[PDB]
Amino acid sequence: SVPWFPKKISDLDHCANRVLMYGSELDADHPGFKDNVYRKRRKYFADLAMNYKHGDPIPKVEFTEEEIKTWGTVFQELNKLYPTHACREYLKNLPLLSKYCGYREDNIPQLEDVSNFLKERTGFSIRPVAGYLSPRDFLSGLAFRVFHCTQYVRHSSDPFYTPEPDTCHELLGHVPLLAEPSFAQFSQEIGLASLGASEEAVQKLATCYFFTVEFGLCKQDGQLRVFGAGLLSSISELKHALSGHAKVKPFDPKITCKQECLITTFQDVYFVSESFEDAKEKMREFTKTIK
Numbered sequence: 001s002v003p004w005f006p007k008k009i010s011d012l013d014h015c016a017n018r019v020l021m022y023g024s025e026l027d028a029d030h031p032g033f034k035d036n037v038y039r040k041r042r043k044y045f046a047d048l049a050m051n052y053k054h055g056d057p058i059p060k061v062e063f064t065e066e067e068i069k070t071w072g073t074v075f076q077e078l079n080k081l082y083p084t085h086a087c088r089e090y091l092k093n094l095p096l097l098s099k100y101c102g103y104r105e106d107n108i109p110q111l112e113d114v115s116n117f118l119k120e121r122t123g124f125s126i127r128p129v130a131g132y133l134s135p136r137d138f139l140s141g142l143a144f145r146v147f148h149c150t151q152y153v154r155h156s157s158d159p160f161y162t163p164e165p166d167t168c169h170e171l172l173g174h175v176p177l178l179a180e181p182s183f184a185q186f187s188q189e190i191g192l193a194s195l196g197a198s199e200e201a202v203q204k205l206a207t208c209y210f211f212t213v214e215f216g217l218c219k220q221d222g223q224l225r226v227f228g229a230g231l232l233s234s235i236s237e238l239k240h241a242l243s244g245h246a247k248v249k250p251f252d253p254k255i256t257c258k259q260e261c262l263i264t265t266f267q268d269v270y271f272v273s274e275s276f277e278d279a280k281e282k283m284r285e286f287t288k289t290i291k
């Protein structure tokens with residue numbers, strides 16, 4: 001029988017809080033693991049997300065000077081690399097975000113502002129999320145053009161590394177492409193495909209999502225470019241991915257879905273999509289075979 005799935009955007013209220021691992025529950029190896037002040041700050045962010053209901057404005061947060069410095073450090077360096085590394089759609093949308101959502105080195109954009117911007121451009125919206133969700137629940141958000149988004153900032157001891165998504169990853173990695181209609185469509189259809197799907201199918205969709213939305217490369221005017229959010233927010237892997245020393249294969253869902261998703265190291269392999277339109281077409285054919 002078909003498992004429960006959200007049927008309208010407010011139904012995400014019921015699965016968004018089905019958190020498998022709370023945001024405040026840091027793994028032994030976390031840079032802030034021994035920091036009780038950062039631990040409290042994380043509990044504050046997790047509580048904001050848990051209390052959030054669809055329809056609410058996303059609570060605005062006053063970021064500390066230390067958090068803003070961490071953002072600025074990350075921001076400053078990544079921006080040096082984007083012109084020579086990022087896909088054209090990313091480069092087109094990022095200056096719009098600087099203009100309308102206050103992206104700059106000395107300011108962390110508010111999720112509410114970014115959500116209102118996306119709603120206008122592609123109908124995407126943001127939902128703050130406490131911590132890790134099941135792949136079923138995370139992907140179901142995309143069905144309604146909702147991106148579940150972390151609001152906290154990585155620990156300041158190491159601005160260039162995070163074991164997990166933080167809101168620097170969300171704002172710099174994900175948001176510029178959610179503002180692109182072809183990418184938004186591609187993403188939504190991953191979500192739509194997942195709704196009520198078997199566990200098996202959900203896992204394969206989540207792996208395809210990982211190797212496009214999070215670590216994807218594309219070919220544009222004969223060049224390899226980056227569109228994966230996990231690359232776009234990581235100084236070291238962004239450079240590595242286009243370095244010439246990375247393994248690279250064509251995006252092909254039946255093959256890609258067999259690949260392991262690595263969380264604490266560089267990927268072993270990156271997949272190249274011809275275009276967002278082509279990736280979308282390939283997923284449509286793939287979904288027929290698993291659903």
Ligand SMILES: Cn1c(=O)[nH]c(=O)c2c1nc(Sc1nc3ccc(NC(=O)CC[C@@H](N)C(=O)O)cc3[nH]1)n2Cc1ccccc1
Pocket residue numbers: 129130131132133134135136138148150160161162163164165169206214229230231233234235263
């Ligand atoms: C498939 N899936 C699920 O099943 N459940 C989710 O809740 C989920 C999800 N996918 C995402 S989105 C997402 N998962 C990620 C994993 C890794 C990375 N890696 C990096 O950013 C590298 C950066 C670093 N090396 C550096 O130093 O910069 C980016 C990710 N983006 N989430 C939301 C979620 C919210 C909170 C916590 C986890 C996940």
Ligand SMILES: [Fe+3]
Pocket residue numbers: 165169173174214229230
């Ligand atoms: Fe991500």
